[PDB]
């Protein structure tokens, strides 16, 4: 129940996505790798690019072996794409293991690095299903379990910033530990409450019920996971349906109307401002999503606070006053749990046991008058089916899954 070599052993800067340090090849190359939840490849940078100071260089490995197969990967605003390979990965601030992993060479991308960042790539924890090219390039955490003694099952507390900020010119670095094969107890208090993991593809769970500040949106609940909720470490915000973020921003704007704020902050292009330490957090609701138990009609909530949804960005110009942004977005491909949720959780990721658990983090943000919060269990007689079945397509029914 002590980890400690893996405690803080995560890093980034807001906004910018939780990189954990590991190495690749022999002798060992370190990069700076960001923890993905929401994919399934580890794909590195392995060729020059204005955003990368190093990157990962095969011909300096001698136990690279090249796969002779490229990998493209394409997604909204752009793309990544190299050539496919093993070698020796380590987590230097993890288990004490080397194990030999798929590794996509990253050899050109587009809006894919970013400036500042300081992470050279990325690991995919979720499953084969989503891997590119295909389902049987095996994800770096299932080689690491058949390889290894490890554990099936990996945590996250991701820890978030708060005012004051060191730097008006950069911005806020964040912290949090990724304990691979165990749970750690002092990263979290109370109870610790499981969801199942509905589908092995990216970590899929169902909500049943949504308030905001004690008030339920009282939608059909398919609606809440319309086409299907996920927990992801590779997403900033918290964001919902497009019909579920139209209620949740009504019922936002309305408990925080003393404050008219610019239609520009509710889409989270601007920023609003408090004078130092003055931000009024009380205006603003709690937001409390009802996650399926593991028992047949059980539910517990996990309940976040502005602290969480309003996230702080230093201004420049304004250096005096504490800015935030607005971290709920419209999806149109259903909910994802982002760090705007996982910041005020420790997240246990149980692969051996096909569930997720959340418990109130040690490191959340808060006031001496509310707490992030993980309740239950909530029994509801006769509990209606919450999950979407996405339409099945032609294309993928043809697979063979051999
Ligand atoms: C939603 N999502 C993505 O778009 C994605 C897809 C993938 C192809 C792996 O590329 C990236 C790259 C960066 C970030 C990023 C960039 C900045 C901050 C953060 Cl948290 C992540 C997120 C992703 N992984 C995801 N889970
Ligand atoms: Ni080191
Ligand atoms: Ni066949």
Redesign the pocket.
């Known amino acids: 129940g002590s980890f400690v070599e893996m405690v803080d052993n995560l890093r980034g800067k807001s906004?910018?996505?939780?990189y954990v340090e590991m190495t690749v090849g022999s002798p060992p190359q370190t990069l700076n790798i960001?923890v993905?939840?929401?994919?399934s490849?580890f794909?590195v940078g392995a060729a020059p690019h204005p955003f990368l100071h190093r990157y990962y260089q095969r011909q300096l490995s001698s136990t690279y072996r090249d796969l002779r197969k490229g990998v493209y990967?394409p997604?909204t605003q752009g793309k990544?794409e190299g050539e496919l390979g093993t070698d020796l990965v380590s987590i230097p601030h993890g288990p004490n293991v080397t194990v030999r992993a798929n590794i996509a060479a990253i050899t050109e991308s587009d809006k894919?690095f970013?400036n500042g960042?300081n992470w050279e790539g990325?690991l995919?924890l979720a499953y084969a299903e989503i891997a590119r090219p295909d389902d049987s390039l095996e994800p770096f955490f299932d080689s690491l379990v058949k390889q290894t003694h490890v554990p099936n099952l990996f945590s996250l507390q991701l820890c978030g910033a708060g005012f004051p900020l060191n730097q008006s010119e950069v911005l806020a670095s964040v912290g949090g530990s990724m304990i691979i094969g165990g749970i750690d107890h002092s990263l979290y208090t109370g109870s610790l409450w499981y969801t199942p993991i509905r589908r092995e593809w990216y970590y899929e769970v169902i909500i049943v019920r949504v308030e905001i500040n004690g008030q339920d949106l009282k939608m059909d609940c398919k609606e809440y996971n319309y086409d299907k909720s996920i927990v992801?470490?590779?997403?900033?915000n918290l964001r919902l349906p497009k019909k579920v973020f139209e209620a949740a921003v009504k019922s936002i704007k309305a408990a925080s109307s003393t404050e008219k704020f610019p239609d520009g902050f509710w889409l989270g292009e601007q920023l609003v401002c408090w004078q130092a330490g003055t931000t009024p957090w009380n205006i603003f609701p709690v937001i409390s999503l009802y996650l399926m138990g593991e028992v047949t009609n059980q539910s517990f909530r996990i309940t976040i606070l502005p602290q969480q949804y309003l996230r702080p960005v230093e201004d420049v110009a304004t250096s005096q006053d504490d800015c935030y942004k607005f971290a709920i977005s419209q999806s149109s491909t259903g909910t994802?749990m982002?760090?705007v949720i996982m910041e005020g959780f420790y997240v246990v990721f149980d692969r051996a046991r096909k569930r997720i658990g959340f418990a109130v983090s040690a490191c959340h943000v808060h006031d001496e008058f509310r707490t992030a919060a993980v309740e239950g269990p909530f029994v509801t007689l006769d509990m209606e089916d919450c999950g979407y079945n996405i339409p099945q397509t032609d294309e993928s029914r043809s697979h063979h899954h051999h």
């Open positions: 906004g910018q996505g939780y960001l993905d939840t929401g994919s490849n794909a990967v997604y990544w894919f970013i960042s990325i995919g992801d470490s590779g997403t900033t994802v982002g760090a």
